């Protein structure tokens, strides 16, 4: 059965992410649904840009 | 800070389905899978 | 006159620095050699894809 | 390491941009000093984004 954007639901929260070489996956929840999905960042870039940017803002960007 | 393992294994499956199991070697997958599990910690 | 006030298109996002809740991007503009500090709120709406692409270029560790 | 070709004078201008934006009376001076020290360090060493 469908997962990711294919659920046709609206993005709820971005919980977490994981980088794999050049691939970045986001772990997300949808409104009205309880499941947690891995979604490639390319699949949500254009639908949810400000939510994705706000998620990155919430992270600690640091050195070294 | 606990997320059910089954839910994490679903997400890993999502990732395999996007990338394709034939797109990486088995150790590449195995090292990435450990990275995937540690990143939930 | 600096930042979006130059009225030039964004060229490249070079860097960022975070101060508590304030995130600044350091950017260049098309046709201009200067580097400007710009608060992410000033470019968020106009250049979201470039911003996201810049974050993608960083290494997101476990730790 | 593309950042290495960036001049000190350029970083100071960018700092002045941050100050013009927030600006100077919005933090204590020792708050500013610590942020400034981390601002200079941020150009020199590679960044990690930390899932919090």
UniProtKB/Swiss-Prot annotation, chain B:
Subcellular location: Nucleus; Cytoplasm, Cytoskeleton, Microtubule organizing center, Centrosome; Chromosome
Coiled coil regions, renumbered to chain: none
Top-level taxon: Eukaryota
Region ranges (Required for interaction with rhi/rhino): 1-41
Task performed by this protein: Developmental protein involved in oogenesis. Required for germline maintenance, stability of mitotic spindles, localization of patterning determinants, oocyte growth and fusome biogenesis in males and females. Also required for dorso-ventral and antero-posterior patterning of oocyte and eggshell. May be involved in microtubule function during oogenesis. Part of a rhi-dependent transcription machinery that enables the generation of piRNA precursors from heterochromatin while maintaining the suppression of transposon-encoded promoters and enhancers.
Subunit structure: Component of the Rhino-Deadlock-Cutoff (RDC) complex, composed of rhi/rhino, del/deadlock and cuff/cutoff. Interacts (via N-terminus) with rhi/rhino (via C-terminus); this interaction is direct. Interacts (via C-terminus) with cuff/cutoff; this interaction is direct.
UniProt name for this protein: Protein deadlock
Species this protein is from: Drosophila melanogaster (Fruit fly)
Full-protein positions shown: 5 to 45 of 981
